[PDB]
Every structure is written in C-alpha cells, then in structure tokens.
Design a protein around this nucleic acid. Structure first.
Ligand SMILES: Nc1ccn([C@H]2C[C@H](O)[C@@H](COP(=O)(O)NP(=O)(O)OP(=O)(O)O)O2)c(=O)n1
Ligand SMILES: [Mg+2]
Ligand SMILES: [Mg+2]
Ligand code: NA
Ligand code: NA
Length: 326
DNA sequence: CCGACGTCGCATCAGC
DNA sequence: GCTGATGCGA
DNA sequence: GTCGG
C-alpha cells in the first residue's frame, strides 16, 4: 500500500480511457503501469524514479510529479466535473453496459440509477440483471463466504456425476482474503480435446445448482461458459447474503493446466505472460501453448503436464498462484 | 520514429 | 438460417 | 501511453 495514491490515480485514468475515450490500449497502458508500481517495494519519491519501471513512460512520470507535489491531478479533477464523463462512468458500472451502450443511454437522457429503473424495457437481459443487483455486485466476498460457496458447488457437482472435477480459480485460487466473484473451472472425462461424448455437461451442472436455489439468475450461457448469479442460503431470521457473480468454465479435461493457468489470472498477469510468450515465439490460450512459425502461424500444441511446463516453455521461473496477483 | 499492443465465449445485429 | 463483425466480458 | 525494432 506504499504507493496507493498513485495507483488509484492511474486506475481512474485507465477507467476514463476505457469507458469515455474508448481507447482500450490506453486503458491497458495505465493498468500495466498501475500494476508495476503496486508491487514496487519503495514509497516512490518522483516521476523519474517511477519512469525506470517498465510500463511507466514520460507522460505518467509527469503525472506522478504533479500528484506528489499537490495530492491531486488537474486532468482528473476536470474529468470529474464533466457531466458526460461522470454519467458514462456511472452507467458502465452496471454489468452489461459498456462504453458504447453507456454513451447511447446518455444520448437518450438515461443517465442515473433512477433513469435505469424507469426504463428496464430498454435494457437487454444481462443489463437488467446487472441493474437488479447493482448494489450487491459492488460488494466484495469474504474468503469465509467463498469457502462456503466452494463447499456447495463441489458437493452439488459431485451429486450430478462423481467424475466431474470443479476447481475454484480466480482471485480465490491466488489466496485472496476477499474476492469480487466466484470463478469455477469444470472438467469431466467425457469432454476432451478429441471428443465430446456427452451433451449438456455444463447444462446439467447449472440446472442442479439452480434446483438447490444456489444459482438465481443467468447472464449468459453456452456449451462451455456460464455467467450468472448465485446466493448463499441464510438461516432463520437472518438477513440474506448478497447475490454474487459466478462464472463457470467447462474446459477439455486434457487441457486442464492451460485452463487453470488462464482462469487463475490475474488478468494483467495473463496479458503479461501471453505477451512474453509471443516474444519467445509461442502463443498461449486457455487450451494450449503453441509455437509460432516464422510465417507467424501457430503450430501444433506442445505437451503440457503441469502449469510449470507452460512457464518452462517461455523461460519463466515458476510462480505459485499467490504470486500472480498483478 | 512508429507499429503493435493476449486471447477467446456468448449476445446481438447486419447482410445475404 | 448462416456468416462475420461488434460489444462486452472472463 | 509505452516500448522495441
Ligand atoms: N481481461 C481478462 C479478465 C479475466 N481473465 C481471467 C483472469 C482472471 O483471474 C479470471 C477471472 O476473471 P475475474 O473474476 O474478473 N478476475 P479475478 O478472479 O482475478 O479477481 P476478482 O475481481 O474476481 O476478485 O479470468 C483474463 O484472462 N482476462
Ligand atoms: Mg473472479
Ligand atoms: Mg469472474
Ligand atoms: Na519506464
Ligand atoms: Na459495465
């Protein structure tokens, strides 16, 4: 927490560029810089000192000098007083409302929470659930609740078919004391890179979790990815738990290590690792690591028998999940 | 300087 | 309906 | 916005 003021400022600039300017690579730039500063183990004294870090260039060094001298950033102070930016930045906090739909809504005069609640019929299904649980989805999940949720998911999955394996990934697998949501990696021996010997493998699991009233809403659902809402059960006279976001990803059982590497994250860790892979002549997705030809076309999948095999290919020392929180 | 920035699933829409 | 592009998100 | 060719 040494450089919290600086990393907050950068994150808010990143959010501005994503939501308002619609400049994804500036969003990624600010986020990478925020990340590299967050793990820097000194209280930063100057923009110059920060500029030595990879991802911090001239412009962010100048903003850090301003922030350190004054405690504020004029650029942000203006963004905060702009009405369209404030409106757009608010609307994009609803799940399913991105930068384009947020700017469209403002254009139509829909720009507050009360506007959204009067105009549900202008929301698609994902956005309407995001509005429904707007407050709940802002709350973090204590790891103790994550452990209860893990218990339910794993036991309900076992009841469907004892050959399922469910692994909780994301920030939970990295050991976080609180999580934004729950991420569940699912495998089953009938679904491999070579064949799908059983249909509805994801569906059967979703259905069981709805049957026990753990899953309460569905944001999207395909053959391999489910995005929805869940809720722990509460006891008599107890206030209910908040509703939580839950993502379930069915991955071919022989591609578990690539899948669990992907789903463990962090998101910035994945970006950095896949960028480094490219620099080493490989491409990594959630299924495989493959060589790059000089052509520039991916080759055949390389053998992978642990997450560490993937690190070895790109000549990275292994990093445990808890050390991937970039 | 300047091209290039990780990789993909599901929802939705345009065009045929 | 199919295909491909765009939005949004993991 | 940053960085490597
Ligand atoms: N842009 C993104 C977003 C997510 N992911 C992967 C890495 C994440 O750890 C995993 C799940 O995404 P997530 O739930 O939004 N983030 P994560 O679980 O790390 O932290 P929380 O905010 O959920 O506590 O998907 C990715 O590879 N690229
Ligand atoms: Mg998560
Ligand atoms: Mg998630
Ligand atoms: Na730098
Ligand atoms: Na949003």
């Amino acid at each position: 927490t040494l450089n919290g003021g600086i990393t907050d400022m950068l994150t808010e600039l990143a959010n501005f560029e994503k939501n308002v300017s619609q400049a994804i690579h500036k969003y990624n730039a600010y986020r990478k810089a925020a990340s590299v500063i967050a793990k820097y183990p000194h209280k930063i004294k100057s923009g110059a000192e920060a500029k030595k870090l990879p991802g911090v260039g001239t412009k962010i060094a100048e903003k850090i000098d301003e922030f350190l001298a004054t405690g504020k950033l004029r650029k942000l102070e203006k963004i905060r007083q702009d009405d369209t930016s404030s409106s757009i930045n608010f609307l994009t906090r609803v799940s399913g409302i991105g930068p384009s739909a947020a700017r469209k809504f403002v254009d139509e005069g829909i720009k507050t929470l009360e506007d959204l609640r009067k105009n549900e019929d202008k929301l698609n299904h994902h956005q309407r659930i995001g509005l429904k649980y707007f407050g709940d989805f802002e709350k973090r999940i204590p790891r103790e609740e994550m452990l209860q949720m893990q218990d339910i998911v794993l036991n309900e999955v076992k009841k469907v078919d004892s050959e399922y394996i469910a692994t909780v990934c994301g920030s939970f697998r990295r050991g976080a004391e609180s999580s934004g949501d729950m991420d569940v990696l699912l495998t089953h021996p009938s679904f491999t890179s070579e064949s799908t010997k059983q249909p509805k493998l994801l569906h059967q699991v979703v259905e069981q979790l709805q049957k026990v009233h753990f899953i309460t809403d569905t944001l999207s659902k395909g053959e391999t990815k489910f995005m929805g809402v869940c809720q722990l059960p509460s006891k008599n006279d107890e206030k209910e738990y908040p509703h939580r976001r839950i993502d379930i990803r069915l991955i071919p059982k022989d591609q578990y290590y690539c899948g669990v590497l992907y789903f463990t994250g962090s998101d910035i860790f994945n970006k950095n690792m896949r960028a480094h892979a490219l620099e080493k002549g490989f491409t990594i997705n959630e299924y495989t690591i493959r060589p790059l030809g000089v052509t520039g076309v991916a080759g055949e999948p390389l053998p992978v028998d642990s997450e560490k095999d993937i690190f070895d290919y790109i000549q990275w020392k292994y990093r445990e999940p808890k050390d991937r929180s970039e």
